[PDB]
Symmetry: C3
Subunit: 597 residues, 3 copies
Amino acid sequence: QFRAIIESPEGAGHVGYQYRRNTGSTMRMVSDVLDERVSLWDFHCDPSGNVIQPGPNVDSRQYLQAAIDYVSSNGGGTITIPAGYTWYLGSYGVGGIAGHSGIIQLRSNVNLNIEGRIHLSPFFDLKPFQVFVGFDNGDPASSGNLENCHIYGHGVVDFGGYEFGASSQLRNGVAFGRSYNCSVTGITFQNGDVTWAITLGWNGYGSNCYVRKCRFINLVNSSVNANHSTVYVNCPYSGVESCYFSMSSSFARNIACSVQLHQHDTFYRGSTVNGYCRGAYVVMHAAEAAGAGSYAYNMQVENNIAVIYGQFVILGSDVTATVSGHLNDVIVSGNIVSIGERAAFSAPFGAFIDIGPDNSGASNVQDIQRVLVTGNSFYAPANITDSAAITLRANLNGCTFIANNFDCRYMVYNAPGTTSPVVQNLVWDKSNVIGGTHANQRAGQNLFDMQFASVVNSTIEVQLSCEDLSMFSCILFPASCQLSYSKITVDSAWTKSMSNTAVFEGNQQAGANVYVSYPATVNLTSYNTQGAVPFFSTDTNYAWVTSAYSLSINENLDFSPPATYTNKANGQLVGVGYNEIGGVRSVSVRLMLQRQV
Amino acid sequence: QFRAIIESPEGAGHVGYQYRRNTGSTMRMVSDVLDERVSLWDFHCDPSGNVIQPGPNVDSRQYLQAAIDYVSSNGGGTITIPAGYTWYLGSYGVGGIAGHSGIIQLRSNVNLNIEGRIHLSPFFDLKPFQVFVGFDNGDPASSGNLENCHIYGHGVVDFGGYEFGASSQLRNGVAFGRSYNCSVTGITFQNGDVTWAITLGWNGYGSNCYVRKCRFINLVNSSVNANHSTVYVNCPYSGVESCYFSMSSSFARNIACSVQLHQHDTFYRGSTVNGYCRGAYVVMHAAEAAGAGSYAYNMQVENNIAVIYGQFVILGSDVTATVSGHLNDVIVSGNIVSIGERAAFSAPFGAFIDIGPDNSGASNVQDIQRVLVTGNSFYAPANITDSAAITLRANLNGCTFIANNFDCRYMVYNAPGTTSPVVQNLVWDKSNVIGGTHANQRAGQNLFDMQFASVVNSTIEVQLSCEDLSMFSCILFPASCQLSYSKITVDSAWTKSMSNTAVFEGNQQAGANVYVSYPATVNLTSYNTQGAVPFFSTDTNYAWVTSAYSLSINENLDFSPPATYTNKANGQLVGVGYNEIGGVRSVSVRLMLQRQV
Amino acid sequence: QFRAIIESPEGAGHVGYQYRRNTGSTMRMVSDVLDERVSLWDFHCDPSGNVIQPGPNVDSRQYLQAAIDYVSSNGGGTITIPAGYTWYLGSYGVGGIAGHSGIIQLRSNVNLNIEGRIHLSPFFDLKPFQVFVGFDNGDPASSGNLENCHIYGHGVVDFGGYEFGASSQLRNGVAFGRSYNCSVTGITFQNGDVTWAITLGWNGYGSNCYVRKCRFINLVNSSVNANHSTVYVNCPYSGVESCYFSMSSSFARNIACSVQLHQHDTFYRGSTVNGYCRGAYVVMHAAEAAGAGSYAYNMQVENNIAVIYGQFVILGSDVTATVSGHLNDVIVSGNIVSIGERAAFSAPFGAFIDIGPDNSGASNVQDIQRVLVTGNSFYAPANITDSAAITLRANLNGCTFIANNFDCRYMVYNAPGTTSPVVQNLVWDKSNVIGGTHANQRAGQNLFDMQFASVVNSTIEVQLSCEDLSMFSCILFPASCQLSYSKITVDSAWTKSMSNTAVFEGNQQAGANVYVSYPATVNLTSYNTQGAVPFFSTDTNYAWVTSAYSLSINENLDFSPPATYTNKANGQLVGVGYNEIGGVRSVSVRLMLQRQV
Ligand SMILES: CC(=O)N[C@@H]1[C@@H](O[C@H]2O[C@H](CO)[C@H](O[C@H]3O[C@H](CO[C@@H]4O[C@@H](C)[C@H](O)[C@@H](O)[C@H]4O)[C@@H](O)[C@H](O)[C@H]3O)[C@H](O[C@@H]3O[C@H](CO)[C@@H](O)[C@H](O)[C@H]3NC(C)=O)[C@H]2O)[C@H](O)[C@@H](CO)O[C@@H]1O
Ligand SMILES: CC(=O)N[C@@H]1[C@@H](O[C@H]2O[C@H](CO)[C@H](O[C@H]3O[C@H](CO[C@@H]4O[C@@H](C)[C@H](O)[C@@H](O)[C@H]4O)[C@@H](O)[C@H](O)[C@H]3O)[C@H](O[C@@H]3O[C@H](CO)[C@@H](O)[C@H](O)[C@H]3NC(C)=O)[C@H]2O)[C@H](O)[C@@H](CO)O[C@@H]1O
Ligand SMILES: CC(=O)N[C@@H]1[C@@H](O[C@H]2O[C@H](CO)[C@H](O[C@H]3O[C@H](CO[C@@H]4O[C@@H](C)[C@H](O)[C@@H](O)[C@H]4O)[C@@H](O)[C@H](O)[C@H]3O)[C@H](O[C@@H]3O[C@H](CO)[C@@H](O)[C@H](O)[C@H]3NC(C)=O)[C@H]2O)[C@H](O)[C@@H](CO)O[C@@H]1O
Ligand code: NA
Ligand code: NA
Ligand code: NA
Ligand code: NA
Ligand code: NA
Ligand code: NA
Ligand code: NA
Ligand code: NA
Ligand code: NA
């Protein structure tokens, strides 16, 4: 019976087709052409083969898994998750992903085109979950790889608004696993309390994984949530570009970071962030060094836009019993960043760059060097005392700042009587512009507060662009901070009225290989001789000065002080001025003091 | 009758199908699978249901609208506009979009995949039109939102070449309206005389709207066209990336801009522009402040390539009777820009940055601050007198330039006897490289022409990199410009032969908190004493000088002038030189004059 | 017979369909809907119309060509190359592409969606080939254009691992030809020994061609391969963005470049490179000037990540008998680059920028100017003697460096007794940070080794950030290098112990329009007079010095040397110090020598 065959599930396999009636084309059956595509509807059926409508009382998980399993068996393809429907997930998956609280297991070469919505059912309320998992084993070390898996479309993953049940729980959207050529593009992740939205790689295993043109909206909502990083990049040659991240929770302002860059050759570009505590960590964790080595290098954070409450970029490296992690060859450029409206001390200490201790608080394990911070803007509102261009809280082996515009409370800061970092190769070029928003707010404060164990091979070229007479000093070194083989300068513009410009509480500017210059007021007295006549300082704290020159006009007719000075062994300054008429002269002059510059 | 059913429109609904003969798959009908996609052909039919071929004598509008209306009713989806066909539009739409001269009404969740061509018929010649409109009401204030609407593909929107009929008319390609998560990707807009190609948002209402990888080609063609901006970004968290803009009309060189960034958290990146008057406006219009506040902040213009005839980036902010607009936290970086080949004064005044008055010409309403211009190149051909790094034509509350390369006629310019802007926090770092293309062209001109009412808290560090002895001065302040709490320096390199370096026509460099240095030639005479001997200037216009030092060699054996000088109350310079043999000496020396630096 | 028609190839054309049972929709046949898409299966059939399975023993070429030819005839469309299959190509194409060793001929408006794999069969071993060719004629000058051709998908082009048979052979993946609005997106090119993977345009003919989000993996594998450039951009308004390039061969480290930018308005952005000799050439070849003029301008290399073995960006321009090529208006910004681990001299000389001779070795043909290198990082390991910020090997008409961080052996280098370039407008701003990795390695070497015929209108502002007492000098000019109208400065920080700072082997710092400053040690003797007393240098090689000042402390009580000095006609320095008590004094002081600064 022909009628019977046609009405049967093999019917389309009996109806002939030839593309556009082209006599040169293949003589196919309708089913062949329909078989070129596949959707969730092709697996979303009961045991008799009748289609099941999705909805809040239907658990779509087993059907989607069957679709992925079947396409995987044919070498791959793309499964569409249809538009105009919400597909709910309502149970855990089984096997290898159960160890990861997994819902769906991803498979190699099987792409998901999510055009409709995927939504978690209340079964998951107060429970852990990882929605899509690419590991195939509960132990990631024993997992196979996931390759050539792409998730893309105009659709949505909705985490149902459910809070965490316990802080120790973990929640994720996509864990690609040991992931090679995998990506998420176009998707909106929203409405949750999760740990991560996407994680790429596993402990350095993976390559060429990307997140592009995704949105992440309101993914922390509770005090229970221990920590949140929206994308964790844990394989090399991988990155995040052109994404949107937004949070509205108060809790997110204290715990949430947009991106973790944790392996070499990784990037974070062209993205916009609002409502987060932190922008990006750039870190080499020794505990994550298995797949790609012990070094994080070629790290790029560029051309992002951010409103955060804590720190924009945080650098780190640490050690384990048998591995040491190193961070080097980093670039941070083109970013425009602000600390959002908040009270002082109400969120983690505001910073553009933070050199942070390790997760246990250790500040003597880091090996961070060859970092370039250039062509960025940073702003914090004037009330935010806790705002810095760099908070330098752990050992630093080098960081270079060129041509940034920093408009916040401090330039360089570390809290006194906390950690005592060892600092090498800190370079603050004169082309860094220091803004004026916090003028008049700096009573008792040092603009560059050098609260370190030691500083070597460092450059700080201070250039103000407006007055701030509230500040205690432009730069201060406590006596506990050794300083050697360094260049510290304070340009005189906007400093004439400052009582202190640079302060060396241990007289460290006297060091043999310290090169400094800064303004000071000096009292001088002359001899009485008519004609060329010496002037000498009354104080004797200039034994370190190599030359000094006048920054003051001479209101006198009958004499002039020296234009330039040198020193004497007793620590006086001395120079030769001119008495048109004789007499002992006394003057108080603003000088530029110079040492070896 | 089985034959009858099969031949009927329900026939495919009787032919069974099961994906790849998989026994676990859904037992569907052919029509179910065909129903997973939708195209214009599914609505492009006569009242009897017979398909109609598109073409220049068929108006496809009602069919496309029916398709959008129907898909909208099912929760959304993607309508394909087929490749290999041109689909003409030949009438106005009806209802809510009639108030916007709308052709097609877009609807939420309904995407258009434009693979073929859409082409306007001559019905639209000399008339207004907006091809795709997302408003649902003639009054945008009473409109609902458009959400999740994406237009993408390899296809083309062709505006038929028709000129405007009257200057007051408006024409647009896509007006998304009060638009949330909407985008245009891949599409070519060409061949028209329009006001805009795409507009995003409405008066700050909207979010997450983007234009990516689109082309805009020849969209102004007539003298009637009043004004053209290719993409208008009027909602936050939105932007333009990786687009191509080109014009060939002469009129475009005087009226056309590529992008308007008019709300916070907006960007313009990675794009190429040719043939336009202007690159981008970055503006907060008080009249547009309803949806997202009164501040435009986090504005980003980065890594674009442009050949324009007028100004690359134009900044603005203005007020209404009850709202004041503010612009702050802007970054302009990585752009390479030139003024195209043209006669001087033949297009609007060439500039990299323009600080422009409001639309009525007011220059005393702006609140523009915290702008960073860094790491850009600008070039204008040597004949273009009207070319500047910045034309500063309205009040400015701050702008910072670091590490740019500007190769044009002026660095800082405003026309004398026009507006008198009040300038604060203008910072021109010494790392800005001033090119040499216009050397020898600058007779009668000041490189930095400070034609302002006042300048405060500003820095100008001039550094030449080649000679230009044609210029009247490196920097000039008219007597009408107050100057205070500022730093103005002229490096001596390539200046030895200049008669004027810095010029203060009101002697403003004498101010208590002005910090300056610049070269000058000075005549000095000594006393006759053998030995250490004073030299004094013949002129008395140095009462403001704090120190000066020699920039000239000493061709004498029998004496030497002072290496360094200070001043005296009568305005003479004085220093101590050395007469090996006695005698009154007279010399003319090049000095670096310094005040408080 | 109805049964007969239904089973025939016209069967689907008799089965009715109406979208979603919508009474307003078109009353179509199943075949109409199936005809909206097209795949390789629709042409991959034998002469009787039976489908043929692809595989290593089937040559899919004729079937894919038939598909492209047919779709082209209907106005275009998109052919899918199905996922889950490998499609082998095993013969050359015929006609116009035979002259290009072409396999498949691309056609206008016909896109390829490559979801599966395309793989070359061993027929191609040791032979030339170009897999996809858009020329339609063996002579490219007589070719028609290719327009609106896009290749995209998650699929793969695999070149079969075959080595080149002869060095003179050429191999390519995609040659778009005289190409307008063409692109490759998402595709992986791998496993070959080829000349290029993609070429865009032909000798300036073409426009709006792009390569985005592609991977290029292991595309050189033999010593026979003469030269490799992964993407060659030979039309304007075209570029490469967000790509991944990797090589593992030793040969690639000596021959392979990622990108060629060879026409105006072209870009290379956001890409990652590993294992290559070179990053990008930016060149105007006169021989390629036919389609778009003789000038390459608006050239952009930005925000790339690279590990290379030779040079990152190489600039060039050259001439033919009748055309002269010019390069100008270039920007290189935001790049983070390193020379990978290698022995010194084991690959082409390491550099960030190279100013290279033409292909015959000529260094006197170039017209390269208006280049900005800003905000980049460069690192080479300490053992790599052959590493430079710029190797300046051919005539240079201008290049500007601002705010970079260069950490390698040399800053400026050219080999002595090779070429003698004529240098104009070389600008090295003081904001360039010179790293310390190569400290102690520089015995016998000059950090800036100015091995040129002449230098004019140039600026070199040297600023160290750590000591390197191994170096012979910071900057050296041989006597053969003329120097005029230039500024050369050496900041004193970290230089106190250097015997030579700046060296002018021809005494070129004496030039009338040379502006210099650098530290030196000077021996001085005083007269015996008590009181103000002159000090004079013992040596007479300071006739060029305009002023000098002390960089040393004064360990004496009874006298002080001058703080500042000028010169005398005999070449002595002279200044006025102070003898508290009389006596002839002798001192050796570190001075900052200054000329016209
Ligand atoms: C939220 C965030 O990323 N915060 C980082 C911080 O990251 C560390 O702390 C977070 C806290 O959530 C992670 O530690 C938690 O998770 C790991 C991994 O979970 C296990 O392994 C995965 C593969 C499996 O699917 C799960 O079922 C678990 O079995 C637990 O081991 C740990 O006990 C728990 O606290 C984060 O771990 C990393 O997570 C990434 C992404 O999933 C994995 O690729 C890594 O393998 C895993 N690393 C390690 C060492 O386990 C911790 O690294 C950063 O340390 C910090 C400074 O950079 O910034 C943020 O605070
Ligand atoms: C071409 C361009 O954008 N030029 C800008 C300039 O913009 C102002 O002038 C232009 C001239 O074309 C616009 O003003 C015209 O259009 C508005 C808006 O049209 C009405 O509202 C829309 C929603 C509706 O669809 C239409 O049918 C109209 O009813 C008219 O009100 C105005 O009279 C007319 O001149 C531009 O208006 C803005 O247009 C954007 C994009 O469509 C809308 O989102 C805004 O709501 C609308 N703003 C206002 C205040 O109405 C004017 O703003 C800039 O001012 C200037 C400096 O930045 O740069 C360019 O010259
Ligand atoms: C690998 C590479 O690109 N290296 C560049 C170097 O480029 C020059 O040398 C390469 C060597 O492979 C090319 O020269 C070879 O190819 C050309 C072109 O082949 C012919 O024309 C094409 C259209 C046709 O399909 C083929 O069948 C051939 O008939 C031969 O003419 C030449 O003899 C041979 O050595 C490269 O040529 C350019 O190739 C691009 C891309 O295919 C074409 O668009 C251009 O038309 C062609 N240019 C010329 C002048 O022919 C040579 O230009 C660069 O010169 C160098 C410095 O910038 O960098 C790298 O080393
Ligand atoms: Na686990
Ligand atoms: Na660095
Ligand atoms: Na200490
Ligand atoms: Na209207
Ligand atoms: Na600023
Ligand atoms: Na005034
Ligand atoms: Na050929
Ligand atoms: Na330049
Ligand atoms: Na010479």
